[PDB]
Point group: D2
Chain length 116, copies 4
C-alpha cells in the first residue's frame, strides 16, 4: 500500500465516510490518465488504491470529491473538489499518505512521505 488517503470532517469531528477519491497519472502526452479510484471507509481511510509494482515514478493527481460529500449532508460547499498534485518516487519508491481536512469553505491537505 504505497498510496493511502485519509479524509476528516472538521464540522462534525468525524472521519469523512464514503468520499469518492480519483487518482490520475500524467501521461507522455501531458494528459491525466486514470490511475485508480475508491471511496473512504467508515474510518475515513482509503486503502488498496495501488501496488508497489503499479505505482511508478510520475506526476499524480488525487481528486477528492468534497462537493458530493457536503451536498449529501445538506450543505452547499465552496470547492468543486480538493486536489493534490505531486511528483512521486523521484528518488526511489516511497509510501505516501495524503490527509485532507474538510470544511464547507476550506480544506487543508498534508502529506507524510516515508521510505520503506
Amino acid at each position: 500500500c504505497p498510496l493511502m488517503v485519509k479524509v476528516l470532517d472538521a464540522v462534525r469531528g468525524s472521519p469523512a465516510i464514503n468520499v469518492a477519491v480519483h487518482v490520475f497519472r500524467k501521461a507522455a502526452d501531458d494528459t491525466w490518465e486514470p490511475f485508480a479510484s475508491g471511496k473512504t471507509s467508515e474510518s475515513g481511510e482509503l486503502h488498496g488504491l495501488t501496488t508497489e509494482e503499479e505505482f511508478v515514478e510520475g506526476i499524480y493527481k488525487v481528486e477528492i470529491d468534497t462537493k458530493s460529500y457536503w451536498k449529501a449532508l445538506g450543505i452547499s460547499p465552496f470547492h468543486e473538489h480538493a486536489e493534490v498534485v505531486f511528483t512521486a518516487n523521484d528518488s526511489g519508491p516511497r509510501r505516501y499518505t495524503i490527509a485532507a481536512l474538510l470544511s464547507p469553505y476550506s480544506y487543508s491537505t498534508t502529506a507524510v512521505v516515508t521510505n520503506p
Copy 2:
C-alpha cells in the same frame, strides 16, 4: 498597531464577527495578567489592541472565545476557546498579525511577523 488579530469562519466562508478576544501577558509569578481585550469587527479584524510603547518583550496569550461564536450560530463546538501563546518583542519591537481559521471541531492559527 503592533498586534492585530483576524478571525475567519470556515463553515460560512466569512469573517468571524463579534468574536471576543482577550490578550494576557505572563507575569513574574507565572500567572496570566490581562493585557488587552476587544471583539472582532465586521471584517473579522481586531485593531488597536496595544501600542509600541506598551508591547514589550514577554510571553503573550491570545484567547479567542470560539465557543461563544459557534453557540451564537446554533452550532455545537469542540473547543472551549482557541489560545495562541507566543514570545513577542524578545529582540525588540515587532509587528504581529495572529490569524485564526475556525471550524466547529478544528482551528488553525498562523502568525505573520513583519
Copy 3:
C-alpha cells in the same frame, strides 16, 4: 475587485511574495482556458485579476505555483502547485477572497465570500 488571492508562508511567518498565480475558467469542451494571471505583492496579495463585468458564472481554477516559491527558498516541496477549484457567480456576481497558507508538505485554502 471581485476576485482576490492572498498567500501566506507558514515556515517563515510572512506573506508569500512573488508567487505566480494563474486563473482559468472551465469552457464548454471541459478544458481550462486562461482567464487571469499575476504574482503576489510584498503583502502576499494579488489584486486586479478581473472585473465584475468579466467575472461571470462558471467553474474557476486558481493555480498557485507553490513549487517555484519553495525552490526559490532552497526548500524541497511536496506539491507541484496548489489548485483551488470552485463555482463562482452562479447566483450573480459575488466578491471572493481565496487565501492559501503554505508549508512544504501541506497547504490550506479558505474562501471568504462577502
Copy 4:
C-alpha cells in the same frame, strides 16, 4: 484508550516524533491539575495516556510542546506550545483523537470524537 494524540510535521512531511504532550484537568478550584503526560512515538502517535475509568467528565487541556520540537531541529518557532482545551464526556463517555499539524509559524488542530 479514550484519549489519543497524533502530531505531524508539515515542513518535513513526517510524523512529529518525541514530542512532549501534557494533559491537565480543571479542578474544583479552577486550577489546572496535572492529569497525564507522554511523548509521541515514531509514528507521531501518543497512546495510553488514560483509561475509561480515569477519564471522567471535565474540562481538559492538552499542551503539545512544539517549541522544544522545533528547537531540536534548529528552528526558532513562533508559538510556545500548541494547546487544545475542551469539555469531555458531557453526554457520556466518548473517545477523543486530537491531531495537530505543525509548522514553525502555524499550527492546526482537529478532534475526532467517537461514541464507543
